[PDB]
Amino acid sequence: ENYEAKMDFQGSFDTDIETSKRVNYTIPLLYKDFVLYWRDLEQAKVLDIPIDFSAA
Amino acid sequence: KTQLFPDSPLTDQDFSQLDQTVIDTARRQLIGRRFIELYGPLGRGIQSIFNDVFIENYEAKMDFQGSFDTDIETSKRVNYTIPLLYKDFVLYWRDLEQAKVLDIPIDFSAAANAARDVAILEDQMIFYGSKEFDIPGLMNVKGRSTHLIGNWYESGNAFQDVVEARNKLLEMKHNGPFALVLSPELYSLLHRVHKDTNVLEIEHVRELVTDGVFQTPVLKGKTGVLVNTGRNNLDLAVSEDFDTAYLGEEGMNHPFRVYETVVLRIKRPSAICTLED
Amino acid sequence: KTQLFPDSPLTDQDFSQLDQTVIDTARRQLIGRRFIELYGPLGRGIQSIFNDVFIENYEAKMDFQGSFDTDIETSKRVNYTIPLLYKDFVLYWRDLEQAKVLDIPIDFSAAANAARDVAILEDQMIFYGSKEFDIPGLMNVKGRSTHLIGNWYESGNAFQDVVEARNKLLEMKHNGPFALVLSPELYSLLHRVHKDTNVLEIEHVRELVTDGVFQTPVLKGKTGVLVNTGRNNLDLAVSEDFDTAYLGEEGMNHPFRVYETVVLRIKRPSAICTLED
Amino acid sequence: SPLTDQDFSQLDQTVIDTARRQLIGRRFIELYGPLGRGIQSIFNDVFISKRVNYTIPLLYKDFVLYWRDLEQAKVLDIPIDFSAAANAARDVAILEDQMIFYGSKEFDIPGLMNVKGRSTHLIGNWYESGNAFQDVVEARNKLLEMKHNGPFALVLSPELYSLLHRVHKDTNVLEIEHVRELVTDGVFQTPVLKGKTGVLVNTGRNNLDLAVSEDFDTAYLGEEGMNHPFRVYETVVLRIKRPSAICTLED
Amino acid sequence: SPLTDQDFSQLDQTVIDTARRQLIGRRFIELYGPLGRGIQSIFNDVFIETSKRVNYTIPLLYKDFVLYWRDLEQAKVLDIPIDFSAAANAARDVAILEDQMIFYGSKEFDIPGLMNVKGRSTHLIGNWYESGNAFQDVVEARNKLLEMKHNGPFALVLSPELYSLLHRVHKDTNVLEIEHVRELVTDGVFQTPVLKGKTGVLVNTGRNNLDLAVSEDFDTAYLGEEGMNHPFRVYETVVLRIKRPSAICTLED
């Protein structure tokens, strides 16, 4: 439920706050693996060219 | 802030973030501020305002050299009291302490709800006025044009009604750009997909209403308002804009209040037409 | 200002704000300045202007080397007197003193009304001229094309009429971009939602009129004007643009006047077509 | 500014003295300071709390001085006539007293004789001896029963004030001297009240007061046809905080 | 507290003046000093014609008022004096309550009052409309008080109706009944709205007969901000000690 605002020349004295139910949640983990081969990486290193990222 | 709130748990950065959140939340929901100008922030020294009502206007003159007598129209003076609109929310101490120790941003979510509620209340006050303070609204002002709508389920009736309302407004020597505000039912009926034809009446209607067509949930049933905009016809006086105050710690928690003080001044009621059933 | 107004209650900042308000209010309502160029601000030393009217034009030549004789067309010279258009408003002393003591912005709302009235009068003068000063207008100039419109309640008649008017204009060796100005009734009829088809004639019409289609409340009934734009066909001479003057304190109040001095020069009347009923 | 500073000083003194000699309400009602020009409306809390807003009105009257007479005055070195200024100042004071004692129906401001929540006392035949004393005693008793025990002020119409000038029977004293100790703040008369009416008011700044923005003042309207017009103006209003502290002797 | 020192001083002055001009019992009753807050109960020894000791508990009287932040903000901006008006109402209510407690006592704390104490004299009044009856009644009441070895300065307190009825001319005499009555009662004649109907009290004043024990006089306290407003409370702690009940004569219908 929700409470509306009020219109007055001066503020009142009592405050109305809605109630709620508290629940606890556990943060999951989502992951996936890929692989880079050493021959291609070494060739790129020696040739000074950008590495190919396609499995990522 | 924090200059006048020495005991506030938050620091200046959290207050700035809270103000930003409140302002951003209020900006989206304020339908009435998209076509009505603001008369600046006045201040705390004003508790009442004056409004002048006109009935007639005088045209200009063409001469080689200026005349000697000046003609100034008369007006009726009324006094208005600036109301206050507010809503309260609460921050719990455990979550705040955890955020402080973990050095993570504080979660402001009740403030958004309070700002949304205050904006809705302000729009309601603008469109209907305050009965206890005796302030008129757009839909109940005295000295305004009224029109009766037909069956909008058919095609072309809405265009005819809008044209007739614009003609009624033009008869009173009002030529400025016009703005249309509609209830959700009429707004949905405007976009309805017809069976006999393939027309979209919104495209035809927007040709004439050059200041935009808006919809608001405040209006009930099938009602609408056409207004000739311009700061010389109506405006808003804002004593203090959206702001937050610390009520004071209780129950180890921390309550806050969001409040504002605005009023609507209508100077030329003849520039308003209301479409009713 | 305030250099020539030592006794003015306002200071330079208030005068700047007033000028900004007047200019902004006048900009929206000036329909005639959207397709007509300005011949600069001339000054106080000019009280009359000269206009040249042409009937014929000479084409260019193609040669390997230039010829020896030059052909220059003839014209008729007329003298015009620059009129003055003005409107007065008033600021009350109690409100001004309260704003001064409270250090809040002054409310300028009568100035907007005066500027709107002056702009409406200027548009009326542009579209109809001054009878007493004997200055012709667009709808009553001598040596212009006229066309008779059909029934615009049907579909396609407006397109045919516009095409015929453009053909009439093209017959006089006028190829420049064209602008169309219409009365509110015809403008509404253009956007009308038809029952037999699902056409929007405005989209078809805007294909040919590449300088925009405007509507103005100055025109009465079902009338319109098609004009071949370009500064070599018609323009506006402005001796002094929108400005405000302090009339002088009376009754402890403060009256002000908004005034301007402009005139319209038409040089090639053959580039104008008028659609009439 | 046709006049120098001396002439302006004498003009201000003339207006102030003419106004002060005629005002009645200012003799027993406190002033809520010269607030200034930064305020245009005031708030009143009727403690019975209900808050209302009153718009401060403006009272003014204009006169004119001619240039031939002024020039002759400096030529002959004689005092400058200021009769018109006094004539204007009298009317402003009269209007202020009328507003205080009856209020403005257009500004919707109540007066001392028509405010709601007051006490009403019906007087008897005052042509006899002792009836006035009995009526005053009964009115003071009505005021006392409402927890009001303070200095009292009595304001009467001239006819009733004259009728009070008689001999109190069986004691051979004037009744006015028998009333002046019950009404310890004085007894006043004013031509504003007509007929057989009167008011008894428990004084005190917590019961009622007068809020002023600008006092009596003079302004130059600017030259017109070589003459010199002037305006006399002031801005005042009356706040009644305890309507129960007023008893009206009606008929 | 929003107020600075000057506003607090003005508030205290207003409360003090309002209380002083409204209190009736303090005019003819002595004060047993400002005792302080280290005492919460007092002992009274009643002499009946011996001494009976009774323990009285000091009550607390209070009333609350509120200041609205909009008004102080406007006053600060416009530089105009603040309006302390609710404080006057609170002080008046507190004074009225104190006078009622003095003249009738508290049933919760079973403290006797002037008009209901045990061991007093009672006199039945007649018709005071006729001239001279009130003088006879006062004379008879003083005579009743006289045959008790009581001859000190007497004080008379009456209801407003009886007080007004006394302002006529004495029959077969030039002067009014006020002067003749004040001749006998040398400590003044007072009236209060607390008494209702035709009732009155005649008291032989003196410190040895009755007095007032005050632990804390009129004072103001700040209750802390609430809703951006500012509440205050006016309070005091007093009690009435009657030592010689035989020195009181109550005039009743």
Short mmCIF file of C-alpha atoms in Angstrom, two decimals, chain A:
data_model
loop_
_atom_site.label_atom_id
_atom_site.label_comp_id
_atom_site.label_asym_id
_atom_site.label_seq_id
_atom_site.Cartn_x
_atom_site.Cartn_y
_atom_site.Cartn_z
CA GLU A 1 0.00 0.00 0.00
CA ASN A 2 0.94 3.65 -0.48
CA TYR A 3 0.06 6.94 1.22
CA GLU A 4 -0.72 10.18 -0.59
CA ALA A 5 0.67 13.61 0.22
CA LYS A 6 -1.07 16.37 2.19
CA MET A 7 -1.92 20.02 1.58
CA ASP A 8 -1.64 22.42 4.52
CA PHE A 9 -0.47 25.93 5.30
CA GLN A 10 1.91 24.55 7.94
CA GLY A 11 3.19 21.04 8.52
CA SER A 12 1.47 18.57 10.81
CA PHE A 13 3.09 16.76 13.75
CA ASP A 14 2.51 13.05 13.05
CA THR A 15 4.31 11.14 10.29
CA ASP A 16 2.80 8.15 8.47
CA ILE A 17 5.24 5.56 7.10
CA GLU A 18 4.12 2.45 5.24
CA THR A 19 5.16 -1.04 6.34
CA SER A 20 7.06 -3.63 4.34
CA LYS A 21 8.16 -7.26 4.37
CA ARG A 22 11.89 -8.01 4.47
CA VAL A 23 13.44 -10.88 2.49
CA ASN A 24 17.05 -12.00 2.07
CA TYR A 25 18.56 -12.83 -1.33
CA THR A 26 21.84 -14.51 -2.26
CA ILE A 27 23.79 -13.08 -5.19
CA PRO A 28 24.39 -15.79 -7.82
CA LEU A 29 27.40 -16.12 -10.12
CA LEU A 30 27.18 -16.48 -13.91
CA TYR A 31 30.23 -17.53 -15.89
CA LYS A 32 31.53 -19.03 -19.13
CA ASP A 33 35.01 -20.15 -20.18
CA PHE A 34 37.03 -19.76 -23.37
CA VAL A 35 40.57 -20.61 -24.49
CA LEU A 36 43.46 -18.94 -26.32
CA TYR A 37 45.98 -21.14 -28.12
CA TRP A 38 49.70 -20.58 -27.61
CA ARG A 39 50.84 -20.87 -31.24
CA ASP A 40 48.59 -18.06 -32.47
CA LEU A 41 49.47 -15.87 -29.49
CA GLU A 42 53.20 -16.37 -30.05
CA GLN A 43 52.85 -15.63 -33.76
CA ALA A 44 50.96 -12.42 -32.98
CA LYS A 45 53.59 -11.44 -30.41
CA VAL A 46 56.50 -11.97 -32.80
CA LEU A 47 54.72 -10.31 -35.75
CA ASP A 48 53.52 -7.36 -33.61
CA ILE A 49 49.89 -7.59 -34.71
CA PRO A 50 46.70 -7.29 -32.64
CA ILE A 51 45.53 -10.48 -30.96
CA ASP A 52 42.30 -12.05 -32.22
CA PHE A 53 39.56 -12.09 -29.57
CA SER A 54 36.62 -14.02 -30.97
CA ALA A 55 35.84 -16.67 -28.35
CA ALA A 56 35.48 -13.89 -25.78
#
